[PDB]
Amino acid sequence: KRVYYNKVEFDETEFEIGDDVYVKRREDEDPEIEDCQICFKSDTNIMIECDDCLGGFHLKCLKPPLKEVPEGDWICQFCEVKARTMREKLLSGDLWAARIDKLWKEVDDGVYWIRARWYMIPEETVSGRQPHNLKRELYLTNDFADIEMECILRHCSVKCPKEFSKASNDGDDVFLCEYEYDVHWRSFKRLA
């Protein structure tokens, strides 16, 4: 009744067991480039991301303007004082992210499916975000579901702690996951 695959080409995109993807479930624009929160004008000048609000800021537009991308921690002036991307939607709980556990073709109708293992944002755990959390941090739950591959939006990239900081230039779809979160026991375990 099912034919399982290690990998599947779906709509000219290769999906493989262990891949991480954005998902729009049945029961529930995608801009490449974000605006600077200061000038709102397109530019070749390098744009950095605030650790807190995740807004974009041209280096040359900061006060005082920066020449280089700051190494390590950085927040913008607004967080100092105290259309949406797919990542923005995920982190606001308006779409899902999952790791691909299985892929198969349903024999009865030829439809392709995955077994999704859901990620969860800290806000959606009953105890919520903690001070030590990062804004791009996800937990990998022990919740699973059968989802049609048609419901997959596109890949995201979920990094273990050892590889997260080195992915600082890898774009908007990069997330951190260190822990498995059991939703029933409300407990954490290292993926490591």
Binding site: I33, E49, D51, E71, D73, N169, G171, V174
Partner: peptide, 9 residues
């Protein structure tokens, strides 16, 4: 600090 992309991966 992370950078903002100029194009999708």
């Amino acid at each position: 600090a992370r950078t903002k992309q100029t194009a999708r991966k």
